[PDB]
Amino acid sequence: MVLSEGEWQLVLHVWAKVEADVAGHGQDILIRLFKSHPETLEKFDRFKHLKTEAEMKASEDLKKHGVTVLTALGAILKKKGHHEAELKPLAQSHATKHKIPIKYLEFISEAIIHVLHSRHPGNFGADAQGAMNKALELWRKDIAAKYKELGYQG
Numbered sequence: 001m002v003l004s005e006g007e008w009q010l011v012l013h014v015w016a017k018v019e020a021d022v023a024g025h026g027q028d029i030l031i032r033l034f035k036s037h038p039e040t041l042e043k044f045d046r047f048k049h050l051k052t053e054a055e056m057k058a059s060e061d062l063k064k065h066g067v068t069v070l071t072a073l074g075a076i077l078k079k080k081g082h083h084e085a086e087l088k089p090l091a092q093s094h095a096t097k098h099k100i101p102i103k104y105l106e107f108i109s110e111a112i113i114h115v116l117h118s119r120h121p122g123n124f125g126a127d128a129q130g131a132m133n134k135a136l137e138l139w140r141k142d143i144a145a146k147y148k149e150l151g152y153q154g
């Protein structure tokens with residue numbers, strides 16, 4: 001799979017809006033992930049004690065991590081598919097240290113799409129959402145291939 005330049009433009013256009021408030025978007029996305037698929041929170045020993053959305057919103061540490069997550073993803077998206085170097089450390093830690101199955105990367109992709117759809121309707125219409133999904137599917141495809149090379153393919 002390969003995105004067209006037009007599709008990358010739709011992806012980077014909405015991401016530029018996300019970048020106006022990376023911490024806010026990171027919070028919304030991680031919270032949406034934990035609420036929609038609670039089992040994913042169990043993978044974070046650092047955050048699994050958080051019981052409610054209120055506690056999650058109040059956690060400065062979770063906000064910091066959300067910034068770290070979206071900044072790493074933004075760097076990958078900005079490579080427009082040429083993300084082999086960026087994917088290596090991410091795939092290694094998530095496959096070997098954190099043990100995050102592809103299914104959970106699908107769940108966070110769903111959360112990212114939900115939050116962008118909610119916050120940026122004008123810049124996240126059907127075509128833009130389709131382009132973002134394509135970019136995230138490409139990332140997941142390549143991450144899954146790297147997982148397999150690393151001995152996890154989970």
Ligand code: HEM
Nearest residue numbers: 040043044046068069072073089090093098100104105108
């Ligand atoms: C858009 C997808 C994601 C990105 C870009 C991402 C990025 C990162 C980054 C940059 C770090 C810090 C450095 C590292 O350990 O590699 C990290 C740590 C971690 N990630 Fe992810 N991650 C993603 C999805 C997930 C998901 C879905 C889970 C769990 C279901 C997960 C669980 C973890 C855990 C447990 C850590 C360590 C947290 C800590 O204790 O500090 N990640 N992630």
